[PDB]
């Protein structure tokens, strides 16, 4: 069961925060090698000097690909699985899968890195956002009561009516920098940046396609008239 | 899991070298405060079993049971590692190595397994580094490079990583880590 996330690719601030998160917490193991710092800065509206100073940690040039020092073979040996390139991961898995996966890490002592993932069971990835999210465990917490889709909210306060459930992801209190909403926004910005990286031509594609479709409707009108006429 | 409350009492002997709260004052003694409990327990077990050789700890862990070690590790993990200061002449190179690694030489950045802030990953056993003494960090990197320390497992994560660090790189990155937070 995945969680839906509404990703706004026109939000430059969110994409900038996601790029910062990717460059700091993700490019340690994951490359974005099919994507250049120059294009990322141009599309996110980041000044080239600012991109150089804030997001390029590897000594690469602005026009260089987002390569990292960790080789796939070395990382496969170290982690048991090679950390895949994340340029297209939004297209490979989808944004909802990424949103649910980056928020589904929970402590699991039986695992090599002490964590497991609801979305990606037995994943070889360490929980690298634990400092932000905090300790997440499979425990008992309050979950909204649902009966055959009959979802109960509080009529007055508008907040959910909840009952206790003991197989839920619960963040141990005062264990991470960000609360649930703040970590949700952090993961949303990161997944928004990954969605941009997978499909950097999306907005331009929509604009160009709108113009193309308008032209094709015009041309269709003319061709239809030239056909129906001349078929009399 | 260990008990920090009892570990405090059990960790008094350690505080002679590592400090009462685990923030050692001398550079050659590592700070145990705020270090991952899993990593601390692994290191203590390795030193007990000879997988890691610490001559200054000869026979100190032999009489401590597994639960005592767990309690001490929990107590030290319940503290906060104090942050040192990086050498200004070395902070730039150390920061570049820590955050970016070496694309050409294929050396990973340290920010992946050890957080960008150097807190490590407690569950994964990746040690906290930020604030650790520059002397101790440099010694550990050298030991990994020369194979003196091999308790990082069969995968030889840190042996392989430190094989790609020069002495100047080791010094710069240790200085940067000393001030990292």
């Amino acid at each position: 069961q995945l969680d839906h996330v509404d990703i706004d690719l026109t939000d430059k601030a969110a994409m900038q925060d996601g790029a910062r998160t990717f460059a700091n917490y993700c490019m340690g193991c994951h490359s974005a090698k099919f994507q250049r710092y120059e294009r990322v800065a141009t599309d996110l509206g980041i000044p080239a000097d600012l991109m150089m100073e804030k997001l390029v940690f590897t000594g690469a040039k602005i026009g260089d690909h987002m390569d990292i020092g960790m080789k796939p073979a070395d990382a496969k040996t170290w982690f048991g699985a090679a950390p895949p390139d994340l340029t297209l991961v939004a297209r490979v898995r989808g944004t909802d899968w990424l949103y649910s996966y980056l928020r589904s890490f929970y402590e699991d002592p039986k695992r090599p890195w002490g964590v497991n993932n609801v979305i990606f069971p037995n994943v070889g990835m360490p929980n690298v956002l634990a400092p932000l999210q905090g300790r997440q465990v499979i425990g008992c917490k309050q979950v909204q009561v649902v009966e055959d889709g009959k979802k109960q909210f509080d009529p007055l306060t508008g907040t959910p009516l909840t009952h206790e459930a003991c197989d839920q992801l619960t963040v141990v209190p005062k264990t991470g920098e960000l609360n649930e909403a703040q970590f949700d926004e952090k993961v949303k910005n990161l997944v928004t940046f990954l969605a941009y990286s997978a499909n950097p031509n999306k907005l331009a594609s929509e604009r160009i396609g709108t113009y193309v479709l308008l032209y094709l409707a015009f041309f269709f009108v003319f061709a239809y008239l030239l056909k129906r006429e001349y078929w009399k | 899991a260990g008990d920090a409350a009892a570990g405090q009492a059990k960790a008094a002997v350690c505080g002679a070298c590592h400090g009462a709260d685990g923030n050692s004052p001398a550079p050659n003694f590592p700070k145990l405060a705020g270090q991952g409990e899993r990593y601390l327990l692994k290191q203590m077990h390795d030193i007990k079993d000879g997988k890691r050789t610490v001559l200054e700890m000869t026979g100190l862990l032999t009489n401590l049971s597994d639960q005592d070690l767990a309690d001490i590790a929990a107590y030290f993990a319940s503290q906060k590692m104090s942050v040192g200061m990086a050498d200004p002449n070395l902070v730039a190179q150390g920061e570049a190595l820590f955050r970016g690694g070496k694309i050409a030489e294929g050396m990973p950045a340290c920010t992946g397994c050890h957080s960008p802030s150097g807190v490590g990953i407690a569950t994964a056993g990746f040690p906290h580094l930020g604030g650790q003494h520059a002397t101790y960090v440099a010694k550990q990197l050298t030991d990994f490079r020369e194979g003196t320390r091999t308790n990082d497992g069969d995968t030889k994560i840190m042996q392989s990583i430190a094989a790609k660090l020069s002495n100047k790189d080791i010094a710069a990155i240790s200085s940067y880590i000393q001030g990292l937070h």
């Binding site: 940690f57 | 050498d87 150097g118 937070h181």
Partner: peptide, 16 residues
């Protein structure tokens, strides 16, 4: 605004 948004996570305390 962008610069604050893009601040690196790792902060290093330096002498002087």
């Amino acid at each position: 605004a962008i610069a604050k948004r893009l601040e690196p996570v790792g902060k290093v305390c330096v002498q002087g």
